[PDB]
Ligand SMILES: Cc1cc2nc3c(=O)[nH]c(=O)nc-3n(C[C@H](O)[C@H](O)[C@H](O)COP(=O)(O)O)c2cc1C
């Protein structure tokens with residue numbers, strides 16, 4: 787089952803909602819992640835070029851897919867097939883971002 | 893500011909999250925809408941053809957936009973500029989639906 791993260795559009799995209807699969811994949815409870823930027827999932831072996839592409843895509847409210855090395859709460863590394871999309875109203879205003887995580891380590 | 897509703901993908905798409913704007917527009921607090929299907933927003937003058945188009949789009953996980961008559965908690969009718977899109981993982985699985993509401997009354 788794939789993880790889902792919903793963030794606010796502005797102010798460095800704090801997490802406002804996660805599904806159960808997010809906790810199964812990452813080992814973090816909703817309480818531990820609400821109000822934080824998702825970058826706590828990253829660690830020393832995370833590819834900086836991948837992080838840079840995410841940073842530019844989110845700043846421009848452009849959809850992006852990346853395979854990124856993340857870390858469970860306990861520090862266990864996993865490969866995250868990550869898809870981020872802006873949520874827009876019909877006037878083009880960005881209301882939120884939605885992220886989908888798949889553990890593709892295996 | 894535009895409302896947002898997030899639902900589960902299956903089993904009558906219960907609401908799992910709403911933003912602040914949803915409460916401003918509809919008059920409903922999160923606590924009283926979570927676990928409900930968003931159809932409680934509809935009322936006597938809601939166009940049944942519009943509802944049927946939404947039903948078919950959700951069943952097929954197809955994106956759709958409709959201008960639909962909805963009702964605030966206090967019963968005041970408002971025109972909802974509604975856009976629904978599926979949230980998919982890379983293998984095409986539907987993870988959730990996202991709805992965006994604009995009061996265009
Ligand atoms: C909705 C959403 C979900 C995200 N999910 C993840 C994730 O699962 N793993 C991850 O490493 N980064 C994720 N990010 C990316 C980070 O939050 C951050 O945007 C990225 O690291 C680039 O910013 P930075 O260079 O300031 O860290 C997500 C971002 C958004 C907006």
Ligand SMILES: Cc1cc2nc3c(=O)[nH]c(=O)nc-3n(C[C@H](O)[C@H](O)[C@H](O)COP(=O)(O)O)c2cc1C
Pocket residue numbers: 897898899905929930931933934943944946947950960962972974976989990991992993
């Ligand atoms: C994410 C999401 C958001 C929705 N938002 C609204 C809404 O704001 N107003 C509305 O009348 N119906 C909304 N709906 C549609 C109803 O929940 C329902 O799908 C529609 O009435 C058709 O199904 P039914 O014939 O079983 O009622 C939404 C559906 C989804 C999946």
